[PDB]
Design an enzyme around this catalytic site. Structure first.
Site, mmCIF file in Angstrom:
data_model
loop_
_atom_site.group_PDB
_atom_site.id
_atom_site.type_symbol
_atom_site.label_atom_id
_atom_site.label_comp_id
_atom_site.label_asym_id
_atom_site.label_seq_id
_atom_site.Cartn_x
_atom_site.Cartn_y
_atom_site.Cartn_z
ATOM 1 N N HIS A 85 4.478 -6.499 -14.503
ATOM 2 C CA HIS A 85 3.802 -7.229 -14.071
ATOM 3 C C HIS A 85 2.436 -7.527 -14.476
ATOM 4 C CE1 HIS A 85 2.744 -3.786 -11.773
ATOM 5 N NE2 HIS A 85 2.244 -4.474 -11.304
ATOM 6 N N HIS A 87 -0.948 -6.953 -12.839
ATOM 7 C CA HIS A 87 -2.019 -5.862 -13.230
ATOM 8 C C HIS A 87 -2.694 -5.333 -14.392
ATOM 9 C CE1 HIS A 87 -0.950 -6.038 -8.345
ATOM 10 N NE2 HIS A 87 -1.670 -7.530 -9.072
ATOM 11 N N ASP A 89 -3.367 -2.235 -14.833
ATOM 12 C CA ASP A 89 -1.989 -1.111 -14.977
ATOM 13 C C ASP A 89 -0.600 -1.707 -16.013
ATOM 14 O OD1 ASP A 89 -1.281 -1.702 -11.954
ATOM 15 O OD2 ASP A 89 -0.176 0.076 -11.301
ATOM 16 N N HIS A 150 5.924 -5.899 -4.773
ATOM 17 C CA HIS A 150 4.559 -5.536 -4.249
ATOM 18 C C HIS A 150 3.906 -6.642 -5.032
ATOM 19 C CE1 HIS A 150 1.056 -3.278 -6.325
ATOM 20 N NE2 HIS A 150 1.459 -3.925 -7.888
ATOM 21 N N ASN A 181 -1.593 -0.748 -3.551
ATOM 22 C CA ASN A 181 -2.286 -1.754 -3.337
ATOM 23 C C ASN A 181 -2.226 -2.931 -3.671
ATOM 24 O OD1 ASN A 181 -4.170 -4.171 -3.856
ATOM 25 N ND2 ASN A 181 -5.590 -2.414 -5.455
HETATM 26 C C1 LIG Z 1 -4.764 -2.326 -11.012
HETATM 27 C C2 LIG Z 1 -3.918 -2.108 -9.680
HETATM 28 C C3 LIG Z 1 -4.675 -0.755 -8.789
HETATM 29 C C4 LIG Z 1 -5.479 -0.810 -8.957
HETATM 30 C C5 LIG Z 1 -5.449 1.269 -7.660
HETATM 31 C C6 LIG Z 1 -4.855 1.031 -7.182
HETATM 32 C C7 LIG Z 1 -3.947 0.672 -7.156
HETATM 33 C C8 LIG Z 1 -2.397 0.843 -6.165
HETATM 34 C C9 LIG Z 1 -1.846 2.635 -5.929
HETATM 35 C C10 LIG Z 1 -2.738 2.901 -5.163
HETATM 36 C C11 LIG Z 1 -3.175 3.816 -3.718
HETATM 37 C C12 LIG Z 1 -1.852 4.397 -4.431
HETATM 38 C C13 LIG Z 1 -1.099 6.087 -3.301
HETATM 39 S S1 LIG Z 1 -0.509 5.325 -1.845
HETATM 40 C C14 LIG Z 1 1.536 4.298 -2.707
HETATM 41 O O1 LIG Z 1 0.359 6.599 -0.998
HETATM 42 O O2 LIG Z 1 -0.646 4.517 -1.251
HETATM 43 C C15 LIG Z 1 -0.240 3.793 -5.283
HETATM 44 F F1 LIG Z 1 0.577 4.218 -5.533
HETATM 45 C C16 LIG Z 1 -0.917 2.970 -5.993
HETATM 46 C C17 LIG Z 1 -1.404 0.373 -7.324
HETATM 47 C C18 LIG Z 1 -0.163 -0.268 -7.054
HETATM 48 O O3 LIG Z 1 0.496 0.283 -5.222
HETATM 49 O O4 LIG Z 1 0.551 -0.556 -7.471
HETATM 50 N N1 LIG Z 1 -2.192 -0.583 -8.121
HETATM 51 C C19 LIG Z 1 -3.214 0.074 -8.026
HETATM 52 N N2 LIG Z 1 -4.077 -3.175 -8.320
HETATM 53 C C20 LIG Z 1 -5.154 -4.284 -9.029
HETATM 54 C C21 LIG Z 1 -4.441 -5.782 -7.808
HETATM 55 C C22 LIG Z 1 -5.021 -6.602 -7.628
HETATM 56 N N3 LIG Z 1 -6.387 -6.294 -6.634
HETATM 57 C C23 LIG Z 1 -6.502 -7.692 -6.081
HETATM 58 N N4 LIG Z 1 -7.842 -7.487 -4.244
HETATM 59 N N5 LIG Z 1 -6.623 -8.747 -6.121
HETATM 60 N N6 LIG Z 1 -3.682 -5.061 -7.496
HETATM 61 N N7 LIG Z 1 -2.968 -4.289 -7.632
HETATM 62 ZN ZN LIG Z 2 0.288 -4.041 -9.330
HETATM 63 ZN ZN LIG Z 3 0.732 -0.311 -10.223
#
Ligand SMILES: C[C@@H](c1cccc2c(-c3ccc(CS(C)(=O)=O)c(F)c3)c(C(=O)O)[nH]c12)n1cc(CNC(=N)N)nn1
Ligand SMILES: [Zn+2]
Ligand SMILES: [Zn+2]
Length: 232
Positions: A85, A87, A89, A150, A181
């Site tokens: 996707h 993002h 990461d 997601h 996220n």
């Molecule tokens: C670059 C990316 C991003 C950055 C930081 C953290 C995460 C997490 C994540 C956060 C927490 C947990 C632990 S847990 C399931 O226990 O909560 C996890 F496992 C994963 C995910 C995901 O979930 O894949 N991805 C992230 N991003 C950027 C955006 C757009 N943001 C926006 N405001 N438009 N979205 N993701």
């Molecule tokens: Zn993502």
């Molecule tokens: Zn992710």
């Protein structure tokens, strides 16, 4: 020393690989985002005497370190990469891959979203994945579009030789307590998309989330549970 790597076992700026099955590894790296540190996974699949990479290591320097770790531990060239996707990461590091000769691929939906967001853009478009339930072959894997979860563009990857299901960020690890996220997620559609994955890959033996520890098929139901509770 053999356990699945976490932030506390990866030295600063480095990447670690984990053998999942014959010819299948995950890659693990860590990155800071909005003042917190997170792990993230990708996949490596042997493709004869070459390697297919799934997802970057979340950043340019991490992805350079990934290529160096692959050369050290595996020693076969990465020739193609797929980002699951838009993002950072998943695509952050695509410019590094492209300058190292790797052909980079993503769906047209991912490419459009990456472009609009200012993220790095894979070179090549993967057609045949625009409707939920669609699947295409890509070297030693099958790519599957389960529907919005997601993100609207998220793809999952299956390695049929090993029954490895790489869920990417549409699938969470068992220890998770929220849905990660969710800024770009569709919480209402996500359980339906997970159900599609469950129906399509009932023989999966290893399930790898986008972040955190691999497990078995239980990760899929757990993901639906944490998403439904986040929404409600
Ligand atoms: C670059 C990316 C991003 C950055 C930081 C953290 C995460 C997490 C994540 C956060 C927490 C947990 C632990 S847990 C399931 O226990 O909560 C996890 F496992 C994963 C995910 C995901 O979930 O894949 N991805 C992230 N991003 C950027 C955006 C757009 N943001 C926006 N405001 N438009 N979205 N993701
Ligand atoms: Zn993502
Ligand atoms: Zn992710």
């Amino acid at each position: 020393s053999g356990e699945y790597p976490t932030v506390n076992e990866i030295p600063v700026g480095e990447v670690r690989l984990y053998q999942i099955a014959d010819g299948v590894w995950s890659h693990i790296a860590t990155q800071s985002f909005d003042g917190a540190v997170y792990p993230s996974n990708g996949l490596i699949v042997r493709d004869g005497d070459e390697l297919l990479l799934i997802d970057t290591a979340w950043g340019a320097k991490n992805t350079a370190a990934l290529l160096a770790e692959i050369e050290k531990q595996i020693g076969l060239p990465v020739t193609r990469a797929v980002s699951t996707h838009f993002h950072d990461d998943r695509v952050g590091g695509v410019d590094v891959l492209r300058a190292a000769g790797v052909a980079t691929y993503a769906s047209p939906s991912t490419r459009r979203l990456a472009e609009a967001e200012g993220n790095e853009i894979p070179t090549h478009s993967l057609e045949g994945l625009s409707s939920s339930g669609d699947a295409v072959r890509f070297g030693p894997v099958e790519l599957f579009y389960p529907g919005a979860a997601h993100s609207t563009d998220n793809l999952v990857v299956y390695v049929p030789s090993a029954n490895v299901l790489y869920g990417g960020c549409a699938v969470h690890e068992l220890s998770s307590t929220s849905a990660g996220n969710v800024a770009d997620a569709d919480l209402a559609e996500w359980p339906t998309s997970v159900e599609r994955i469950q129906k399509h890959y009932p023989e999966a033996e290893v399930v790898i989330p986008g972040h955190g520890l691999p497990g078995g098929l239980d990760l899929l139901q757990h993901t639906a549970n944490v998403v439904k509770a986040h929404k409600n």
